[PDB]
Write a protein that binds this ligand. Structure first.
Ligand code: ADP
Ligand code: ADP
Ligand code: VO4
Ligand code: VO4
Lengths: 556, 556
């Protein structure tokens, strides 16, 4: 049973706030004892024969106990509520950090939309788990644990009945658990299929709309829903049977305790009222012993998502060394490849047996057939994945002996797909040099021909853009990416298709500025348009992961 | 109070399944009456003086009533559980349909990731609302409604006390409601800000990682979380105060009922036991009257998301006319523009005063400066938004008098950003002609040079691709999009930057096949590379939403 594992992990995640956790535990123990003490007082006061309640009597003890009860209820309802939200925010922040720090392959293979779903439906489940646990469960657990001795002290037969009730509850839970586990695995798989289909279609609404396949897609979703609820029903059937069994056990226990109280007619003590006290005990227990069962149901679902949330956390194998790592500094520019080879997981293709050198001050232009291993070479330079066999040598330092923070600080890149945030243009250019100035932002925009179109439209620089920069067409996105890269001003520069959506005039106007600014550094340009590489100092072309010439600018 | 509105809307959404809803209501009424009848039996049987329970006695009535109670509990726990999931799936399917059918501007301005979040957190809230409502609330509402007459019949003073309890609960709920509403609006706004930031960053992990700003982004998220929980606390404070007040009212009502039962010592009837019966009443009520209050808390949050889910549903203003619309058929190809103008909402730019004509059998190539209103013209042709002033004329038919299904069936397009589904390549090509054959799929792949690279890699055609086609670089995505468009074979063809990521050789090899296949139809090509428009029959260029020449292929 992973219930113990996930509960202990939730406790470990909750143990950071000691100062409040111990207080919550103490208050829970106190309120459990109050809820245990109330029924005994009720049995003592329910005599109603010659009690004379309105003068002192156990009714004053009632008043004091109820006042303490309401005060403790207020304290718990405030403290647990205030703790749960703060701790959920903390867990979300730490998990978001660990999620961002993960490499790109893990994101591409799984994430984009599934990762955020995992985050949200794990943190919300953990929050509800913490809140319900604290209040109801941390009352009831210690409440029953302290109750069973008191039940043993007077009228041990009733304590035996209560023990039988507890054993029956445990047995029925365990019996239901196997079938529910078997069903819930398939249920979770089917739900994942349904959600991934929904996300895939919604994220690509333009294509599904522009091809008249809305009806087909909704029919596919209906089929997925039918598949999901086809295997869903047995789980609900078994849970309902469990509810029936525990309710029947509760009814039988009530019958037993009433009959035993009646049979004690021979032992005519004051228990004429105290029996009612025991009744409350059972009542109390039964009510609480129901609240856990449905609770268990919740976690039997939650497990699924929680498991992923832990499989991510245990996957914190990223370690750039605490201090043994030597952050590379004072970059001059010297790129050397040593027999670099890469095989994609469960696939072919990838660069094979490449070795070339780059001297400082000169630019390198990779051309050739499409899909021939250019983007993979470029992102091998930035080390988004470690080459399987071979070395990448930077100015007398191996790349695998360099901190990630230092390596990517000296490499400024424009990707093939210019990614953008939906913030303002000012912020989208500020993600270069962090806090240089506004004048340099203006200059960088001017250099990449980004100032001309933006100085006279839509509230100036403080202009919002839509998701993935959907409000600036395609070419303007390329201009903003180029301006950002130029503003970062790193010794190593990369431009993967910098002129994918620019006409000839803007292409020339941008490339001349890029050359003027980058002549002091080393840059790579990946393009099929040979016009932009007229100033290239090392022109090379590679076909299907294999070099051909790797010669100078002018060669045949 | 929108509580009545949203509850009535949930009921209307639940009224489709009449055959099961009426059964659930009947069972709820029955179990409410059973829960009302039990305490009276308890008061009658708790005498324990000369009852002689083990021979007949009210204990047999206990046994029968408890058996009916457990049977009804099983029936409700099965029926409500089976109903809720099926109805949630139905609501999700219908809302997904309405979401897909909405226009592109609404998606771009808001959706991609927020729309799916709205869907999921609205449907899950509705599901939990339905389940909790049915079981607990549709028991307790009619239970109390039928209880208050019985309380009035015997010992009207206790009924008065119960009425006072109910009035106090209503008053404290209403008092808490104003402050909770004021807080929850700001809380929801802040949560939306936090989630949009998280989604924006996660969806763009490559850029945030490649610029060493993970620390800055997590600090921004921490600041957002601090802002969210800064205004969160007063809501929890007020809710805890409400819990304290209702618990105090419950305790006072218990004191009142016990004291009144004691004062009835003068009226020495059998009520010596029946008073205990009333106690259970109060007990019952109090417990149930607590379950609603926290329930209300839930919906006070849920409202926010639910409101959006209704604002979407009420926004079903899309109507292509049921039958008055005339689906355009037998397309020959004749595109005419009539003074078409467009102003973007709260922005400048857009095509101004355009009018041109297209004859069948000839192709039209739009060139010119970047960001000059080309993509907007093309998507005006497909009518993703209605021109503000002007007409689009297709073969003697106005476009606004044409069904959307018929119009986009005759126009096959490759977008500037070639969108792809993460299904196999076979499925990504099957979204053209729906069920033509496999041989024509192979031929279409061969024509667009997509067969050569794929015949010998990664399990053939049945090759999965990642999210947004991340597993095929960029150029292969363009080839797949071109192959899809060619396979659809529509009389009107559009190619927005069909050679954005192809070298010269593949560009020629693809454009010759495209020309050979499309010479029988009319096509538009939007490109800054003049090589692909060597066969263009109508070359025109437009600058900042204004035409210049609109001449033939050869002009100066
Ligand atoms: N995540 C991946 N999984 C499998 N194959 C991949 C993946 N990424 C790239 N490839 C393969 O690597 C080849 C080259 O990719 P890439 O370098 O991105 O394109 P280009 O060669 O045009 O720069 C492609 O043919 C593609 O099939
Ligand atoms: N959703 C939008 N909101 C505001 N402005 C837009 C939007 N979409 C496009 N524009 C403006 O319209 C102009 C032309 O856009 P578009 O036609 O997509 O590019 P192109 O002219 O290169 O085809 C751009 O300069 C852009 O500023
Ligand atoms: O629609 V473009 O920005 O490729 O001219
Ligand atoms: O598919 V490419 O990386 O040659 O633009």
């Amino acid at each position: 049973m992973s219930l113990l594992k996930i509960y202990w992990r939730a406790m470990q995640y909750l143990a950071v706030e000691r100062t409040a956790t111990i207080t919550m535990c103490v208050a829970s123990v106190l309120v459990a004892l109050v809820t245990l003490a109330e029924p005994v007082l009720f049995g003592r006061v329910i005599q109603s024969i010659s009690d004379k309640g309105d003068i002192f009597s156990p009714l004053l003890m009632w008043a004091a106990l109820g006042g303490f009860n309401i005060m403790a209820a207020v304290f718990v309802a405030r403290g647990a509520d205030r703790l749960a939200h703060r701790r959920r925010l903390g867990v979300m922040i730490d998990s978001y950090e660990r999620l961002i720090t993960m490499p790109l392959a893990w994101h591409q293979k799984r994430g984009t939309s599934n990762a955020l779903h995992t985050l949200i439906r794990a943190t919300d489940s953990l929050f509800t788990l913490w809140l319900e646990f604290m209040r109801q469960h941390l009352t009831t657990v210690v409440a029953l644990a302290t109750l069973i001795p008191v039940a043993m002290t007077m009228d041990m037969r009733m304590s035996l009945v209560l023990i039988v009730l507890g054993v029956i509850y445990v047995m029925i839970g365990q019996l239901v658990m196997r079938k529910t586990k078997d069903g819930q695995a398939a249920v979770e798989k089917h739900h994942h299929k349904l959600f991934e289909h929904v996300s895939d279609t919604i994220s690509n609404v333009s294509v599904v709309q522009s091809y008249n396949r809305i009806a087909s897609e909704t029919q596919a979703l209906r089929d997925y829903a039918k598949n999901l609820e086809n295997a869903q029903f047995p789980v609900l059937n078994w849970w309902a049977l469990a509810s029936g069994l525990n309710r029947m056990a509760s009814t039988f226990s009530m019958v037993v305790v009433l009959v035993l109280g009646a049979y004690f007619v021979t032992k005519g003590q004051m228990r004429v009222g105290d029996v009612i006290a025991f009744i409350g005990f059972a009542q109390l227990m039964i009510g609480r012993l129901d609240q856990i069962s449905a609770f268990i149901n919740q976690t039997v679902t939650a497990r699924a998502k929680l498991e992923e949330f832990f499989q991510m956390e245990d996957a914190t194998a990223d370690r750039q060394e605490p201090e043994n790592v030597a952050d590379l500094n004072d970059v001059k520019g010297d790129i050397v490849f040593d027999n670099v080879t890469y095989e994609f997981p469960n696939s072919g293709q990838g660069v094979y047996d490449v070795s070339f050198e780059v001297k400082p001050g000169q630019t390198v232009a990779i051309v050739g057939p499409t899909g021939a291993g250019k983007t993979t070479l470029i992102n091998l330079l930035q080390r988004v994945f470690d080459p399987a066999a071979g070395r990448i040598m930077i100015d007398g330092t191996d790349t695998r002996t360099v901190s990630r923070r230092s390596l990517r600080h000296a490499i400024a890149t424009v990707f093939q797909d210019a990614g953008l945030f939906n913030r303002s243009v000012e912020d989208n250019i500020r993600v270069g040099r962090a806090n240089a100035t506004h004048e340099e932002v203006h200059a960088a925009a001017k250099a990449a021909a980004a100032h001309d179109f933006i100085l006279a439209k839509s509230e100036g620089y403080d202009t919002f853009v839509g998701e993935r920069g959907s409000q600036l067409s395609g070419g303007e996105r390329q201009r903003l990416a180029i301006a950002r890269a130029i503003l970062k001003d790193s010794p190593i520069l990369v431009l993967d298709e910098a002129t994918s959506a620019l006409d000839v005039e803007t292409e020339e106007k941008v490339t001349q500025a890029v050359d003027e600014l980058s002549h002091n550094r080393t840059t790579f340009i990946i393009a099929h348009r040979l016009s932009t590489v007229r100033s290239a100092d090392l022109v090379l072309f590679m076909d299907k992961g294999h070099l051909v010439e790797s010669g100078s600018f002018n060669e045949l």
